[PDB]
């Protein structure tokens, strides 16, 4: 039931013949899996956690200077020198000043001058490495077990609800799990925790209690003073000259000034990176995906041998419509004939009692043996007018329902959802809701080839360059002499423009 209020929600109608299905969990999503004579299940990937991270390099972004000193030499007498040039904590520079009889020199001309200042870092950021064998994914499973509506985002005493909820920890040395769901049997998950988000070309950057996932190339192109991630008491700062500027004032003196704190400049440089969080010494990540294979052969309906309920039902609240077109119905049941089966039909006309819409919650039941107990069902009504009829006999309650839209619009939104999933996941999108098949394999192969070529050519472009190159390619295609290069140019251009103007 944990999938009901979510706006990014997928529905998998598992194949009847087989008992396994391929799913891809994402962090801003949730998957509902329904199979023929088994309970409906909700899957959500909630947390990625990286541990045992190694520090690579520290960068200074705020520094001070002190103990400035200078020294000068007469012309044609070699370069100037200070003992502070033999100290590694000082940054020094050499230039030329004017010398003559007025300055105390015997000659006239450019003499050598040296300026030294003691460097000190006050604020630094770090970068760490993440090995895919140290990740740990957390997945939550919920059963559509006719819990009432006040349990959707309810975590009170969730460690006791061992039958409706399950929490799974997927690591690389434990990628296959048997999840026990009480009287519903079990499911088996076989996941691939090593090939999700590509943490191989990402560093975990920490700056002032904020955390990002950044590119490694970008992290090595930083232009700040740095030292190694190795442990040491006194670190030697490399490239101190990145934060200290030396200047000669009209060839009479030389002076050193430190630049300001770079926190805001780095914030501006991280504009497109991914944000992350911390948990002690562990990185907590809320982006990326996880591919799994579900086997439901040991999953069984609890209460498929229940008796029908004999008492009367009331609507405990108004049935609401979720943004995907399904509808939630909370019922209250009077009379105590124990756990029983809830009779509910969705029909186009009350005369014929012909079912026309299906259920999402498979096998809705009353779960308690008390007097006035609540339960919730999720249904998938047909387009147009319908009736939700609950109960049997002379106490049947009815609710009129209207579902706007059409089936053509539903197919169109499904197509756009699939296209967005392709754009986000690449060729992995072909493994979503897949049960094998030659068509899926050929599609995944062609997508792999074309995606590799497309990333090789147009990999390092921004929305601006994407737009420019796309318009140029569309123009070049509109003027191509023969075919097969006109359509190719225009297709690549349209793809680039679609990528540039995308969202999320």
């Amino acid at each position: 039931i944990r999938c009901i209020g979510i706006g990014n929600r997928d529905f998998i109608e598992g194949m009847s013949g087989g008992t396994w299905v391929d799913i891809v969990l994402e962090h801003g999503g949730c998957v509902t899996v329904m199979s023929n004579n088994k309970p409906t299940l909700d899957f959500e990937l909630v947390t990625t956690t990286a541990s045992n991270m190694a520090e690579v390099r520290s960068y200074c972004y705020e520094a001070n200077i002190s103990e400035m000193a200078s020294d000068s030499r007469c012309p044609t007498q070699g370069e100037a020198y200070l003992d502070k040039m033999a100290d590694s904590q000082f940054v020094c520079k050499r230039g030329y000043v004017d010398r003559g009889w007025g300055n105390g020199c015997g000659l006239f001309g450019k003499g050598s001058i040296v300026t030294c200042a003691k460097f000190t870092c006050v604020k630094k950021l770090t970068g760490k490495s993440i090995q895919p064998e140290n990740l740990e994914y957390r997945v939550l499973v919920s059963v559509h077990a006719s819990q009432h509506g006040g349990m959707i985002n309810n975590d009170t005493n969730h460690q006791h609800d061992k039958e409706n909820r399950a929490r799974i920890d997927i690591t690389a040395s434990a990628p296959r799990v048997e999840v026990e769901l009480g009287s519903f049997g079990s499911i088996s998950m076989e996941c691939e925790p090593r090939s999700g988000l590509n943490f191989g070309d990402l560093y975990y950057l920490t700056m002032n209690n904020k955390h990002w996932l950044v590119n490694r190339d970008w992290f090595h192109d930083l232009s700040l003073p740095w030292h190694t991630g190795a442990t040491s008491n006194n670190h030697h700062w490399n490239n101190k000259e990145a934060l200290v500027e030396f200047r000669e004032a009209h060839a009479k003196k030389q002076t050193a000034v430190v630049l300001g704190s770079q926190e805001g400049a780095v914030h501006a440089a991280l504009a497109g990176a991914l944000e992350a969080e911390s948990d002690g010494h562990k990185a907590t990540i809320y982006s990326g995906h996880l591919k799994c294979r579900l086997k439901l052969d040991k999953l069984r309906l609890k209460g498929m041998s229940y008796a029908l309920c004999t008492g009367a039902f009331t609507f405990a609240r108004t049935p609401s419509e979720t943004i995907h077109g399904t509808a939630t119905v909370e019922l209250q049941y009077a009379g105590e004939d124990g756990p029983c089966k809830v009779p509910i039909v969705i029909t186009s006309d009350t005369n014929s009692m012909a079912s026309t819409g299906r259920l999402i919650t498979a096998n809705p039941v009353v779960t308690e043996s008390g007097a006035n107990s609540k339960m919730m069902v999720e249904i998938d009504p047909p387009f147009g007018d319908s009736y939700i009829i609950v109960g049997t006999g002379t106490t049947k309650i009815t609710h009129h329902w209207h579902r706007a839209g059409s089936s053509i619009g539903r197919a169109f939104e499904a197509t756009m959802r699939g296209a967005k999933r392709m754009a986000v996941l690449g060729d992995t999108a072909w493994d979503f809701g897949s049960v094998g098949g030659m068509f899926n394999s050929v599609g995944k192969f062609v997508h792999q080839v074309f995606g590799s070529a497309f990333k090789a050519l147009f990999g390092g472009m921004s929305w601006f360059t994407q737009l420019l190159i796309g318009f140029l390619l569309i123009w070049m295609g509109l003027n191509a002499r023969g075919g097969t290069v006109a359509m190719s140019f225009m297709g690549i251009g349209a793809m680039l423009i679609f990528l540039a103007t995308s969202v999320s």
């Binding site: 994402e26 970008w218 700040l224 630049l259 400049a265 497109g272 982006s287 123009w475």
Partner: protein
Amino acid sequence: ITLPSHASQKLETRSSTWLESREYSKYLIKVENWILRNPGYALVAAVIGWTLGSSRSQKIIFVTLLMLVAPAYS
């Protein structure tokens, strides 16, 4: 200094990037403010592009490329 600009992680996950609300204003505002601060370069670029290109499309493309190269000195 001149810190490097991170590439956009849009369309890699479902999450939004670090400062995604400003991803479009960044280049547009810069280019527009530069063009308003330097209106004579527009005439320079028009002359150069109209002299270099032969067909009208080539001239337009030359002028556009020069007007885009100037504000971000590249």
